[PDB]
Symmetry: D2
Subunit: 504 residues, 4 copies
């Protein structure tokens, strides 16, 4: 897989693939190359003409810095801003941030040199693993500086073939990549932006979209195991409560299948979760293709170098706080259906499906839902300002992105527990059969987890079914039975950006 | 203003007007009347043919006629279980009008005469007694509404808002109490109208304060003597979120390196605007939804269908997110208030008062703003994230959106005061900069503020000024002043027209 | 009816009584009078000798006599910056009395005459106008208090609670308005008395509902016909938390495997009790603290000292934790309510009603309880965890405990209703079990409940019963009924006497 | 480092040492042995006499054994990352201590095997998510002792086959008789062991917070006026007075400095209170049903397994510890602010080319901000998982974990303040501070050189954090501080509360 970046076409799903698919590689388009060199020409003219421009050849102090002191300034910037702490990002997430960094630079408004972008490109393709401590950003100078630090051959680096973090200098020699060198503005160009929040957010919303579909598969199985009626899927019901999500979820369920609230009101609950995920997906897709640099370089603009606030991460921060809340509800209602499966008076099945069955598995699901409620608190609602700097308002979206991933990770396990329990319900109902797509899912689950005869170590089954869900095999199985519109695919193509009806 | 309801055309702004504008009246369309009687014909046939249908003439087996009526009354009474302070007259009447609108869709099976009575009571000026706590998302609130319509419990009127005997109040409006036939009990109390009516007020107030936030910001921008550099349309063209671009255009209209609270304002106000716009869309759909159960479809394959449209997760979730979005407007505004009071940051006299030896100026007003932001952070916790299964039976998941709606209103109420404090402080900044002038629209806003709050010479009781400027903002006079200077698209008006509902491409 | 304040002996329960009991009056002790005049002598010397001391006659520069009086007035007026609904008369007057108590410690430098006028205003029945929002933790609220004492802004009286001109109200009461000398402005508005007065009500109500929670539980225990096995003192001897042991003993006194909401009740109520007891101790100290600045020490090495005793983090933190502790009482109670309504869990008629084919019983009452628990979870978020600083001042860290105090009261108010719903439901259970009888104290409670709420024969408006039983609980009649059956130590009375303050072992 | 457990004497600090100090070993007292065998005699008598008692021989001798195994296996339902070796072994030791009270009905042989496994260096595999408050975690512990699932060792921490690890360690797997299954997995030991680490770390960072504050106080050249004992005598909270005395010991006007005793104080008191709750909890009989050989009823069903007590305490610990970081971050802000510090902006001379500690403050602010989310009480929620019995749970598993996270975050914040304040001292040379603070400064300078030109600052932050956690900083100032202000009272177990009345 070789992806061509141009700063306009990147989707969260492609970025996720860039981080997680073996053999992923990036290149930049010819039009991106043209934009980058055009922007750099502006910078080179300002520096050569010894013209004073804040952010270009000024200090920290609107006076002109001498050339040699200007190179040293870039290095001091990268080093002093490498202030992050805690556990480093996983190799996949660190490399997602790297690729996203390159994509944003492709818009050609940072003033970066082409050769610096190439060294970033070459490092990615060679399999570099940046060392990015996950805590520090207030929304992403820190994370992006740690990225640039490794590209300077300083600090720590790893590789895909050897993920033990070691001397960055030796790793670059290992990969045959010459370290970057920094000219004017290159220091800021590399570390200004929302790429830590947005890369992590990209993974979150991708995983969220996929678990939203899978939640309906688990629900369908529970529906069958509990022997519920199809009455609540009547399209007349959802025609008169015509939210997009609710209608789409009901159609998805009808494809798979053609009571209690956790089943009967599922379209009315999954629906809004789906719409939140779809909305967040749109916000993030725009953000992955934004020029978050400062100051901005516009070679064809009335002003060639402009100071703005595009580095502020409130947009993806807010979106990720809401993603967590939306995804959380999928697990919340799922846990209740798990409760019905284990309850003998509710299921008309053997209790918990001298044996305890899936009793404690429901417990695990409830614990995950409970901790998700804490993670539902909006991190971006807080701002802590540095008084005598310029930064008097920040997004605090670093934690928004991380806890969004955690909530989805938790909900994935919850859905796995429901699906696992519901499949056992199907066993208990034999020789009864369910629908063709659901029988295929059941067989798929049974290929990694045998039916529950005697008690056994159940965390193994939970983890196996979770692996199964994350593999994509479950959705791939039911996919051809579902109408195209109900497959959650519309967000996979980049829409044209909003345009003012007046350019005033 | 006489509004004709038809269950398809109601917007949050019209509903807000129905509750808050003097002389508001409702009627229902001819097509709504037709739908209502058509649905009732289904119910009447079922009852007369003595056919067993769950939710129509069953029980808690077919219940005989003389007791089917008693069942309706028992339902209304036993479900009137709400506690706490009653809704304000305006909000109670908003819930009443919204109730009527939903019934106009013609899927509840309600009788026409009952709707007519709900209709007549509203127009006569009835004030329902609706305790604000109880719903898990809205049997309770809607039952209290129906209870008063039965002439039981408490009622008030617009002319006399002291809650008294409901029977005498109906006798005061010359209104005859409702009577309940089969299904009418459920038809009146099934739905999300408590959450959605309160939510309607919230999102309307939110939309208006979002616009006003940019006016306060513009004034602060002028008082702080900031550059227009960050409003360069090239900046927002390459970070092209709809909200960010629209906010920047709105600011360019009012004002035709700085701190982040000013420079990153389009990047912060923008997402707030988009959240508000999104919530507005969710709620507009919800105001025109058939949230009844069981549903009656006279032209359907099944005439009576059990579903889950009463579940309030949709408006509950939207209102939790509205609170978070609106909160940020106050959050960044408070920081700009901080800059205005800070002599190092403002290049103005400290706390916007000259002769600051004996005076404190707007020092403690900033304090009040900070306290409001701080408490908004607690209200930012999503209430709909919780569910307490009220039965090991069938009601095993609920939205808990009652508190989502109420705290959404509280956050917007708080943010309105914050924006008022910023605008008040920024206008004093303008005074301190005289004989300098600002733009034509901002000079008009300044004059408008000065007509309710004089400049700050010596110290005086400042909570009076804060409240006055807050009243000014809520009056609509401030936006009305700058409105003609702003491009139509940047006026936050697109949400005022009801879009056609989403339609499935496939027939599966 | 007459409490003598001395700045050392005030308990939350006495302060609550001062605000809520009819005919309450305050006086100050002789030792307090002596301390006040001694401290004022220090101030008068400083001013007379024209000596420069920050906070007494500075700005910063030594302020001349004429301007020094004007400075006090400007201070009070400009700091009256609070917004929102005013405190209830009882809470406003609690803040007033607490203000006087703190001044009795004699470290504020206040004049005696000023204290006397506050004192006379309280006894005459003044109702201060104190907007509940604004403090960051309490210049605003305390300034609004002083503003009314100046005869400015709004005031009310106990005989006429309509807020009107403060000047006319003081004339009505026969109280001459205060006048302000040096330091008197700061002396009146420095302190944590808004947070602490509201907190005093909260922890008092919390302590009383903690006891009542065990009474409701005991009734539920009987209605559900549970075993006494889990009350075995051996169980709690080996899990010997003070609260758990005390709760179990209280339950044994009223009742002289099972579900967790009953069986683990000592293990859950226990920690709630201990949190309440801990908070009570924190607040009792705080009610008797010198929160002034700068502090005046007539017998100290330094007579006038600048410190940070005005910072409200201590009561703010305590009230955030009170909310969490009280919340759990309602949380576990709601689960017992669920068991009462559940036919498979209770072995009683579903929703505690016979002939439930037309009746719903207490079904929706459980719903109301669940909604209250759910909203309490939002209020459980610690408000004091946030701080918003004013960058260029000296106030770079604040407690934000104003909202901590208010939401603490809200949580307890909610939990009171929950306990009422449980008790109401459990008493119906007792009816359903007749001719069976329960214990002597529980039969008395049942009779007491039946005197305000008849048994549930047919369905009726249930919010009336809920409110009546809530009124009953708050009246104190329920606890008074079982009180003589409970061992003294299990009556939650230890906190009612002021303990000697902690003393350092070392002189360092 | 051989600790003798008896179910009555364990403190959070000793338990922490048991998990983190090399060569730690446990034994049980003779009285504990006596109690265990006495309780087991009750259980043996019941099964021998074929008497029906719920929780002993309920739901034949043959299958009663199978029931125990099914119990352990089916309840091993936890997910996520496993506990660190130190925390897993803390849970193991705490498990043994609770069994020493002699009310579980466990066999002595089983305890000795747990005992032996610990001393041999076993590392249990305990997934950190699942408990609703701790059947899951305790079952995973027992699963490994059965030689099933995964295990590791201190010498080889790669999780592998539990059977082979026990062979490696020379430990024969446990066997389960009647009641032994429940005896091993009933309790609050996952919450309490994690909570023990949290409150220990909290107590130590509370002391260190005053050291950082003292240095900031010196770097900012503040007055000692706010430490006047008369101030705190008239606002006589225990914590506030103790903190002020601690500061006076180290030092013999902005709110973040002036109101520090009034803010650190309540944090200290919360930590001290939580410490007391947890100390009791470490020595509680959380079994069910309970066995009382000398009781009126020998086997009693109760609710001592309910973890609300430690859950609530840990939710409050997080809130209390959080505030230390909150006010510290504000002092960090003052250090970097040239208008507030009267020092070079961001503590760097020649700031035209250098940024100094600017972004380090940024890191501190981010940590405070995320701590605000963790301040939400996890124990405030309950999800009834049983339509009947288990209808209220504590949800204290996450309370314990996020408590550790908050303290971990605050440790870094304090490190950043101390690091910045020491640079302030450098900028003020040839000025000197007090003798104990000069020693702390020298100690910091031994792991982090002064800031001349810009360099990679996350290295310095991590080094100073390591320094704080090492105990060397407190050990340095310890002899200058009055005994009462050293936060040591909680280190000795107080006698348990006793009812006055016999009712």
């Amino acid at each position: 897989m070789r992806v061509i970046l141009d700063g306009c076409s990147l989707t969260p799903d492609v970025l996720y693939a860039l981080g997680y698919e073996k053999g992923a590689t990036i290149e930049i388009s010819d039009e991106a190359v043209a934009r980058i060199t055009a922007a750099r020409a502006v910078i080179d003219k300002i520096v050569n003409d010894r013209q004073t421009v804040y952010g270009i050849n000024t200090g920290f102090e609107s006076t002109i810095i001498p050339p040699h002191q200007l190179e040293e300034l870039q290095l001091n910037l990268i080093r002093s801003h490498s202030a992050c702490v805690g556990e480093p990002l996983t190799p996949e997430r660190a490399r997602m941030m790297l690729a996203l960094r390159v994509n944003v630079l492709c818009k050609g408004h940072s003033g970066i040199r082409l050769e610096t972008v190439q060294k970033y490109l070459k490092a990615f393709n060679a399999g570099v693993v940046p060392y990015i401590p996950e805590q520090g950003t207030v929304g992403d100078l820190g994370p992006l500086s740690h990225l640039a630090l490794g590209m300077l051959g300083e600090g720590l680096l790893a590789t895909l073939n050897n993920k033990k973090f070691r001397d960055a200098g030796s790793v670059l020699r290992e990969l045959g990549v010459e370290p970057i060198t920094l000219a004017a503005k290159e220091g800021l160009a590399l570390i200004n932006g929302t790429q830590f929040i947005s890369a992590l957010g990209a993974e979150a919303v991708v995983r969220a979209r996929k678990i939203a579909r899978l939640a309906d598969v688990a629900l369908a199985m529970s529906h069958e195991a509990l022997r519920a009626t199809n009455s609540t899927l009547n399209p007349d019901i959802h025609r008169v409560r015509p939210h997009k999500g609710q209608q789409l979820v009901a159609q998805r369920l009808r494809a798979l299948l053609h009571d209690a609230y956790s089943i009967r009101c599922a379209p009315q609950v999954h629906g809004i979760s789906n719409e939140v995920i779809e909305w967040v997906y749109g916000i993030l897709t725009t953000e992955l293709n934004c020029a978050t640099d400062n100051p901005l370089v516009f070679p064809d603009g009335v002003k060639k170098v402009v100071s703005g606030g595009n580095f502020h991460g409130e947009y993806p921060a807010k979106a990720l706080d809401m993603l967590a809340i939306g995804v959380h509800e999928l697990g919340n209602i799922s846990e209740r259906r798990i409760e019905r499966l284990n309850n003998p008076t509710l299921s008309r099945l053997p209790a918990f499906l001298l044996n305890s069955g899936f009793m404690i598995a429901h417990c695990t699901a409830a614990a995950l839902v409970s901790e998700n409620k804490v993670y539902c608190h909006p991190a971006s609602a807080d701002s802590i300002s540095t008084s005598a700097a310029q930064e008097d308002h920040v997004s605090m979206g670093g934690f928004s992105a991380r806890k969004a991933i955690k909530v989805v990770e938790n909900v994935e396990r919850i859905i796995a527990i429901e699906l696992l329990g519901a499949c056992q319900g199907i066993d208990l109902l034999r020789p009864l059969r369910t629908t063709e797509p659901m029988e295929k899912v059941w067989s798929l689950v049974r290929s990694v987890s045998p039916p529950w005869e005697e008690d056994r170590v159940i965390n193994t089954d939970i983890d196996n079914v979770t692996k199964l869900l994350r593999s994509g095999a479950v959705w791939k199985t039911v996919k051809p039975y579902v109408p195209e519109e109900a497959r959650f695919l519309g967000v996979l193509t980049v829409k044209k950006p909003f345009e003012l009806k007046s350019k005033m």
